[PDB]
Structures are given as C-alpha cells and as structure tokens.
Amino acid sequence: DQATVGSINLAERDMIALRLKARFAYVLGNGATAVGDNKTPVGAVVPDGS
Amino acid sequence: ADISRSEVATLIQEAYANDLLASAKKGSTVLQAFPTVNMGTKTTHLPVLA
Amino acid sequence: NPIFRDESFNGFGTYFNANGAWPVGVAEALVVDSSRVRIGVRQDITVKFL
Amino acid sequence: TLPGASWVSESATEPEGVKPTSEATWADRTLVAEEVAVIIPVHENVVDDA
Amino acid sequence: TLPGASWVSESATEPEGVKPTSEATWADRTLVAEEVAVIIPVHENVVDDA
Fold this sequence. Notes:
This is part of a larger assembly, with five copies of chain A (50 residues).
Chain A: E1 4-5, E2 8-9, E3 15-24
Antiparallel strand pairs in A: 1-2
PDB class: virus
Keywords: HK97-fold, T=9, tailed bacteriophage, virus
Entry title: Mycobacterium phage Bobi
C-alpha cells in the first residue's frame, strides 16, 4: 500500500497491490537400486512425431 | 550499493537431508522359493533312486 | 485385447528376482518342482568388525 | 554403487582362500530454492466498490 | 567490506537531504581437519613388568 510497482507510486495513486510469491525446489533420486546403477525412476508415454 | 547472496558468503549455511538415502534391501530368491536344511557339518549325503 | 491381465498361475508359488541376480537376455522364467531342491544353509549372513 | 561378494576356498597358502575386498559408493542429488511470483495492482476504491 | 555513513540535513528537496545507501560484505575461510599421528611398539612383557 506504500510501494512503487512498475511506475505506479502506489500510495499517492490511492492504489494497493498484492505481492504473491513462493519459493520451490525439485530433486530426482536417480541413484543405484538393488538391481544396479544409474537407474531413472520415471517412464513416459508420448505421441508420435509430425 | 547493495548486498548480494555471494557477498554474504558462508553466513548462509547449506543444509543436508537423508530422505533419498534409504533403499530397501533384497534377499535371496532361492531362500524364499525352496525348502532349506540346517547343516551341522560341511557335507550331507542324500540318497536318490537312480 | 490384453487377454492375460488377470492371469494367475495354476497354484504355483511365484518368486521374482529383485537382487539383480537375473541376467539380461538369457532366460525369462524357470518352472520347477520345489520339493526336488534343497538349499542347505550351513551359516547365515555373519558380520565381523575388523 | 554396490559391493560384490565371491566364493572362497579353505586355504592358508593359496590365492583362492583369500576373502576379496570391495567398495560401495554414494553421490549427491540436490535441492536449490527458486522464487516464483506476481504483483497484482488495483485501485482501493475499486476493491471497496466490488 | 565495511558500510559508509553520512551527515544528513532535514530536507524535502536538496541532495544533502537524502540518506546514503552502502553495502557490507563477507568472504569465506575454512578450517580443514588433518590427522597427525605416531605408533610406539613395545614388548608386552615390558609393559607388564613396568
């Protein structure tokens, strides 16, 4: 309610804004298994090419 | 003038987690599948009709 | 049509090798009279700290 | 990576009677936090009128 | 790196009126633990006699 966002001086313009954010990370555990090494835990189903 | 993440250096500690570490161990198939015998000595004789 | 999705073998015990002991491209399955095998277990897995 | 066992004979003098050495090994997979966000600006009178 | 500071006048319009912006910064140094050791062999009759 007091910030500047883009070029809107938010208070003097009689505006407000919502700032929404999250922070996220992702990891895949593609190690060795009891069967052997370099194993990927993901398989994919895809359409055929053009 | 401002403070970057690189300019804070090792005041920000990197964390550790063991979530991906554990893997289930697998037993012999043949000890599940077949009747076992407890041996008391190196060698046992089993006669069969021939 | 996938005619075998609800196939279960004729009172057979079914044992799937998860040790990575099963090689690639050598055999798909073995059928056996398990009464004609014994696995003698003279000693079980034992650990000595050195 | 996984260790590997071997079969060994009883001997005090022959190489076939020596228990073999082997290693496991581990590696790192990692989570790095990254920020996703939006600013949504509006007039205070519009928010009161709605 | 150490931050700077300034004398600031009360002022709605003059450059002396503004407050200054400055950084501080840090760098890393590491303790790495290294082994120092000796073995002293002695006859166990001597350590039992002494």
